[PDB]
Design a protein around this ligand. Structure first.
Ligand SMILES: C=CCO[C@@H]1O[C@H](CO)[C@@H](O[C@@H]2O[C@H](CO)[C@H](O)[C@H](OCc3cn(Cc4cccc(C=CCN=C(N)N)c4)nn3)[C@H]2O)[C@H](O)[C@H]1NC(C)=O
Ligand SMILES: C=CCO[C@@H]1O[C@H](CO)[C@@H](O[C@@H]2O[C@H](CO)[C@H](O)[C@H](OCc3cn(Cc4cccc(C=CCN=C(N)N)c4)nn3)[C@H]2O)[C@H](O)[C@H]1NC(C)=O
Lengths: 133, 133
């Protein structure tokens, strides 16, 4: 398992920056943000080659242990064997995920969290730096 | 309390860099490093004015929940209401703590830890950035 951080107290409008190395043979990696492992306002899962998906960003939420409705994006600004930075902010309506190569997208904030306190990384992504503005 | 991080997977010789904000009314702050909350190879407690200490860094270990013997350092390159970076590395014998303004000291690796997987901050120090070299 990857880096797990709690007590982040990330408030609306604040920016969470995560930079890591994508494994040369990476198949997928995960960044989870929320209250705890059962309450995720963002499950961010770029799949290079996993679950039959190729170069697809899979996003979902988890509310009291229940996965929400999966959504998929249409751009994949990740390459195996390279450094990638992911930058995330949220308000009550949406999380805004900013990725390399200028790409940005929004994911509905389906939970009722006053602040993002929990982050967990998994998969083929070696965290090198985490910043809270 | 402050930020808590697990699964750090910090190995001997690797450098953990922590940048944060010392509160303007700082009396004391803490950075704990170890295997988990009950097994700390470093309890790093700069005291501006707390527990009878003035401008003194107090270090200790915790072994299966039992505090070790405190060690008091000779330098204190910290100021209230400022940004400070601490950089930690370790090996079989010692942790090396590098401080602002070129100061550093060593603290024995009392638990003989070969990996640091846990970090926690408390007190008047808001972590803004954590990097792994
Ligand atoms: C016709 C519809 C088919 O229906 C499918 O149904 C599956 C199960 O419901 C979904 O799959 C699930 O989708 C969820 C989001 O919705 C989560 O992603 C979940 O994973 C949870 C999870 C697992 N993990 C561990 C982990 C994750 C990534 C890498 C590693 C690695 C590595 C070893 N390497 C290292 N250490 N370097 C480990 N974390 N979170 C995933 O299984 C599919 O998407 C979905 N597909 C579609 C098209 O709808
Ligand atoms: C009894 C008379 C004299 O004898 C003293 O006896 C004390 C208790 O045994 C020792 O003190 C203890 O020493 C330990 C190391 O060995 C730990 O440091 C421990 O603290 C554990 C601890 C507490 N915490 C939370 C925390 C720590 C610092 C600041 C804040 C907070 C807040 C509010 N501000 C915000 N939010 N901005 C919160 N973390 N670790 C500390 O109490 C003193 O050294 C010792 N002094 C001397 C000179 O002998």
């Amino acid at each position: 398992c990857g880096l797990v951080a709690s007590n982040l107290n990330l408030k609306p409008g604040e920016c969470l920056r995560v930079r890591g190395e994508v494994a040369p043979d990476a198949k997928s990696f995960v960044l989870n943000l929320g209250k705890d492992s059962n309450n995720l306002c963002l499950h961010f899962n770029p799949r290079f080659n996993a679950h039959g998906d190729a170069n697809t960003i899979v996003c979902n939420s988890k509310d009291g242990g229940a996965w929400g409705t999966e959504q998929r994006e249409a751009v994949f600004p990740f390459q195996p064997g390279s450094v990638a930075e992911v930058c995330i902010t949220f308000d009550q309506a949406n999380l805004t995920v900013k990725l390399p190569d200028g790409y940005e997208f929004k994911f509905p904030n389906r939970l009722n969290l006053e602040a993002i306190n929990y982050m967990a990384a998994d998969g083929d992504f070696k965290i090198k730096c985490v910043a809270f503005d």
